[PDB]
C-alpha cells in the first residue's frame, strides 16, 4: 500500500503500516534516502524523500587531503574549486565540518612555527612572514568558499537539509568564519587592516591600537549602499587589551532565510490582526565581533547602530523588531533574541537599530 518510485532514482517497499524503508542516493552521490508513510493507514509522507545525505564525490578526495596533513591553505583553495558546481546538503555539511578541521590544523602549524632559538639573521621574521602569508591565504580562500556556498541558486540544497540542521550548519558557518577572522587578526604584522569581500560575504578584519586619539569604525565604507554597522571610538578603548584590539565585521547576503525563527522574541502589538501570522528575517545579516569573544554578552560603552536594508520593501510587512542571534557553542543551536536591542527608526528602504552588546 505504500510503495512508489521518486525522480531521484529511489524506489520503496509497500509498508502495510508505515515501516522504515530506504534506497541509495542517485548515481553520482554516496548517501541514502529514507521515506516511510506518515500514517499506518497507508498515505505517502507528503514531505517526500530526505535528500539530506547525498554529497558530490569531491568529499572523499578532500577527506584524504585532510589526512595527508598538507598546509590547510591548499586544501581550502581546492574546496572552493569544487564548490563551484551544483551543491548538496552533504557537501554543505562536509564543507562546514571541513572549515572546522582546517582551523585546527592551522592552529597546529601556528603552534609549530614558534621561535625556538637565537635569531641569527632573519629566522623569526621568516617564520612570521610565512605564517601571515599562509593565514591571509586561508581567510582569503574562506571568503571564496562562503561566496560559493551562499550562491543564490544553491538554496535548493539548503531547503533539502532539515530545518533543525539548516540553522545548525548556518550557525557553524558564522562560527568558523569568525574564528578564521580572529586568527587573521592574531597573525597581522603591525596593526594593519584586511578587507576580503565578495558578492555574498563581506569581511573586514582590522587589528587597531588604543594610543592617543582614535576614530570610529564603519563597515562597509560605501559598498552595499546600506546594511552598514558602526562602532564608536570609546568602545575601541574599552575593549582594548595592551594597546591592541582585534575587530572583525562581516555582512552576509543570502544567509538570513536559512536561519530559522525559533523562539523569536519579537514584541507584537495591535497591528497583529492575522489568524495565520508569519515572521520573516527581511534584512541582510550584519555581524561584528571584538577581542576574541564569540558569545559572552560583552557590554559596550557606546551603542552599536546597524542600518540593515530591507530584502523585500513594500507595505505588506506591518511592524519591525530588531533582533540578535544567540547560540550555544556546545550545541551550535541558537535562536533570535531582541534582548538589549531596541528599534530606533524604520521606513521602506532601511531600518536603524541600537544594541548594547557585541
Amino acid at each position, epitope marked *: 500500500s505504500c510503495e512508489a518510485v521518486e525522480a531521484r532514482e529511489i524506489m520503496w517497499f509497500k509498508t502495510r503500516q508505515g515501516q522504515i524503508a530506504k534506497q541509495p542516493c542517485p548515481a553520482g552521490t554516496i548517501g541514502v534516502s529514507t521515506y516511510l508513510c506518515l500514517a499506518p493507514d497507508g498515505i505517502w509522507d507528503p514531505q517526500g524523500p530526505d535528500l539530506s545525505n547525498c554529497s558530490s564525490p569531491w568529499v572523499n578526495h578532500i577527506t584524504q587531503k585532510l589526512k595527508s596533513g598538507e598546509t590547510a591553505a591548499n586544501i581550502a583553495r581546492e574546496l572552493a574549486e569544487q564548490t563551484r558546481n551544483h551543491l548538496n546538503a552533504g557537501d554543505i555539511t562536509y564543507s562546514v565540518r571541513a572549515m572546522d578541521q582546517l582551523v585546527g590544523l592551522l592552529d597546529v602549524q601556528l603552534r609549530n612555527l614558534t621561535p625556538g632559538g637565537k635569531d641569527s639573521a632573519a629566522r623569526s621574521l621568516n617564520k612570521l612572514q610565512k605564517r601571515e602569508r599562509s593565514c591571509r591565504a586561508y581567510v582569503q580562500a574562506m571568503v571564496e568558499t562562503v561566496n560559493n556556498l551562499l550562491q543564490p541558486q544553491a538554496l535548493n540544497a539548503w531547503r533539502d537539509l532539515t530545518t533543525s540542521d539548516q540553522l545548525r550548519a548556518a550557525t557553524m558557518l558564522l562560527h568558523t568564519v569568525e574564528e578564521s577572522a580572529f586568527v587573521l587578526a592574531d597573525n597581522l604584522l603591525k596593526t594593519d587592516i584586511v578587507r576580503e569581500n565578495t558578492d555574498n560575504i563581506k569581511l573586514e578584519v582590522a587589528r587597531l591600537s588604543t594610543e592617543g*586619539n*582614535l576614530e570610529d569604525l564603519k563597515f562597509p565604507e560605501n559598498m552595499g549602499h546600506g546594511s552598514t554597522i558602526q562602532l*564608536s*571610538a*570609546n568602545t575601541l*578603548k*574599552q575593549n582594548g587589551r595592551n594597546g591592541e584590539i582585534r575587530v572583525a565585521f562581516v555582512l552576509y547576503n543570502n544567509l538570513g532565510p536559512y536561519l530559522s525563527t525559533e523562539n523569536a522574541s519579537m514584541k507584537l502589538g495591535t497591528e497583529a490582526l492575522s489568524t495565520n501570522h508569519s515572521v520573516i528575517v527581511n534584512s541582510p545579516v550584519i555581524t561584528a565581533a571584538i577581542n576574541k569573544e564569540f558569545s559572552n554578552k560583552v*557590554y*559596550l*560603552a*557606546d*551603542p552599536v*547602530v546597524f542600518t540593515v536594508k530591507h530584502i523585500k520593501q513594500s507595505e505588506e510587512n506591518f511592524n519591525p523588531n530588531c533582533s540578535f542571534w544567540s547560540y550555544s557553542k556546545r550545541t551550535m543551536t541558537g535562536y533570535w533574541s531582541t534582548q538589549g536591542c*531596541r528599534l*530606533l527608526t524604520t521606513n521602506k528602504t532601511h531600518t536603524t537599530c*541600537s544594541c*548594547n552588546h557585541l
Partner: antibody
Amino acid sequence: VQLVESGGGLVQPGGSLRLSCAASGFNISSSYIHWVRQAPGKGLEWVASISPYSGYTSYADSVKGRFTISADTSKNTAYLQMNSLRAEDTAVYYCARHNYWQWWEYSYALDYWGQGTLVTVS
Amino acid sequence: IQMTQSPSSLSASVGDRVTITCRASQSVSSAVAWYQQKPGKAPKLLIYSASSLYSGVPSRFSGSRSGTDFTLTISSLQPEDFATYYCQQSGQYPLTFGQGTKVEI
C-alpha cells in the same frame, strides 16, 4: 525630572568627601551620568562619567585616581567619591544626564543639569 | 583635542548678528555642541553636532560647520538671550570645552 545634588562644605586639604545626586522622574540604569565642575570665576570643566549599562569609568587627567565615580542605580542615586581632595578642586559640581539609548543623535548632549554642590578647602 | 573661542566678548545690538567661531586643533567631523549658561544658572544645550538646534530651542540660532572652524549665529539678539556661550567637543572622551564667549549688550 530632577537631579538635586548635595554634599558640600569646608574640607581641610587632603581630606575625603562624598557627593550625592538623587535623580527623580527617570532611571539612571538606561541614562548616562556626567560630572562637570565650575571653579570660582572660571569655565565648566569635565570631572568624570559612567556608562549606565557597562559601568565604564573615565576621569579627566586632572582627577585621575584621587576621584572615583560610582553609579548605584538601586537607589536611583549617583555618587562622586572625592578621596585626597586638593585645594585645586574648590568649585560648584553639577551632575548632568544624557540619554544612552539615543546616543548617536544628540551626541553627548547634557539635556538636564542641577543646582550644584559647593566644596571649599582650607 | 583642544579648541579656542574668539572673540571672548561682544555687544551685538538687539536684532543684529553674532558669530562665535571655534578653532578645532584636530580634524573632528562635526561632533561639536554649543552650550548657553545663563548667568548664575545651568548651561543648556543649544546645537548638537554643529548641524541642527535641539528641540525646544528658539529657531533664531543656527549651527554651521566649515570642516575645521565650527560657528554659531544668533539671528537676532532678543534681549532675553544675553549670556555666556561655550564650544564643547562631543565626539569622544576627553569631553574638552572652550574659553567661552559672552554676548553682553
